[PDB]
């Protein structure tokens, strides 16, 4: 029990779903009933790879073997759903947590804000933060980062200033993720004065090494063959808290680069993430489907993903080219086609390949291009400002 749970935790931490599945099969093949904690590690790994179907099967199997889910199990699902913006499934857990006798802790509130944010529900995201303070609790550093992303996403420059300065008002030294979100909201409004003001703060950074290297590489100082090894050195050091922290770091970084005009640099940063296992669902290239999955990405990251995907399309035929913007129960509804990600991807595709990618009549969160229309198709310019 101790060895099985130890290995599965590592698989769930690093998002190695294939290894986690084999440990579960090995335990069953030896007539061993895995513990409730062991299944939670398997559920964690599937959520790291956006394999929601296999994650909910393991959750279903927990009750079958009598290993009822613990509080940590309902957190593995919430963080898995939060990254994809599946607030419909997040509310199912929340409506289940109140019935299961589990009070809402702080971690539950953070996932709720993150799920609503990624799902485009900006009004409901701040309401959770509004209702969180009424219930007392104690917002942590990620909660401040959770609500800062909401304001940064909906282009609130003055709200983002107040949120960001208060982070350092308590001598917290906000992480590199919050700095990259400041660059996005300043880069979205073309506020080039504030961008240079924040960059000089990240250039000195005598205390934190990651801010210095990442801040330097954004400006383009580290774009040399030998000078890209230092940037890679930081990425390998950050590639030790698992895929959970990595996806948050790359989403903010690509968002900052795209809004600052460093669109060619964002292409190489995304290429650095994929080889490290980040965004394993991003691309599929077989004879049937050529797909790009952007439901767990930021707006800047999605644009970078589409730009590379479109350029690679023109190089080469599959039966279909699809863009997965909504991946959940919201697909079977009209709300998915009104999602901010779905509209942004379609708007991005409209003025890059003319009217070649149209919606689907059978799914709200898909943007397809038939094989016949693929014949009638760089397509996107990737340059640094």
């Amino acid at each position: 029990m101790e060895t099985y749970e130890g290995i599965i935790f590592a698989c769930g931490k690093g998002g190695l779903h294939e290894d986690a599945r084999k440990i579960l099969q090995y335990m069953t093949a030896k007539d061993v009933v895995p513990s409730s904690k062991a299944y939670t590690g398997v559920i964690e790994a599937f959520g790291q790879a956006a394999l929601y179907e296999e994650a909910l099967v393991a959750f279903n199997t927990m009750h079958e073997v009598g290993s009822n889910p613990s509080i940590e199990t309902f957190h593995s699902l919430l963080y898995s759903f939060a990254r994809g913006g599946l607030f419909k499934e997040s509310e199912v857990i929340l409506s289940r947590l109140v019935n299961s006798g589990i009070p809402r802790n702080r971690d539950t509130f953070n996932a709720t804000i993150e799920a609503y944010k990624q799902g485009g529900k900006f009004e409901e995201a701040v309401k959770t933060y509004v209702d969180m303070e009424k219930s007392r609790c104690d917002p942590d550093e990620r909660t401040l980062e959770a609500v800062l992303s909401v304001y940064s996403c909906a282009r609130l420059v003055d709200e983002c200033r107040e949120q960001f300065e208060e982070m350092k008002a308590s001598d917290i030294l906000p992480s590199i993720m919050c700095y990259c979100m400041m660059l996005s909201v300043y880069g979205k409004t073309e506020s080039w004065d504030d961008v240079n003001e924040l960059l000089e703060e990240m250039l000195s950074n005598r205390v934190s090494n990651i801010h210095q290297v990442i801040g330097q590489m954004i400006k383009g100082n580290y774009d040399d063959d030998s000078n890209w090894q230092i940037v890679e050195y930081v990425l390998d050091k950050l590639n030790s808290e698992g895929c959970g922290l990595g996806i948050r770091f790359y989403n903010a970084l690509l968002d900052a680069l795209w809004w600052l005009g460093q669109k060619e640099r964002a292409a190489r940063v995304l290429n650095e993430a994929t080889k490290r296992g980040i965004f394993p669902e991003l691309f599929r290239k077989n004879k049937l489907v050529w797909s790009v999955d952007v439901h767990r990405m930021s707006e800047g990251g999605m644009y970078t993903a589409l730009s590379v995907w479109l350029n690679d399309l023109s190089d080469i035929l599959p039966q279909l080219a699809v863009v997965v913007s909504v991946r959940g129960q919201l697909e079977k509804s009209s709300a998915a086609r009104e999602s901010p990600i779905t509209r942004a991807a379609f708007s991005f595709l409209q003025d890059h390949v003319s009217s070649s990618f149209s919606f689907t009549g059978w799914n709200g969160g898909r943007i397809m291009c038939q094989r016949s229309q693929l014949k009638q198709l760089n397509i996107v310019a990737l340059t640094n400002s």
Binding site: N60, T61, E64, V92, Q329
Partner: peptide, 17 residues
């Protein structure tokens, strides 16, 4: 006379919805 001739799958496997 009357003595003659000796007289759970499909559970916990539903749609999450």
């Amino acid at each position: 006379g009357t003595g003659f001739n000796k007289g759970d799958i499909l559970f916990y496997h539903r749609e999450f919805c």
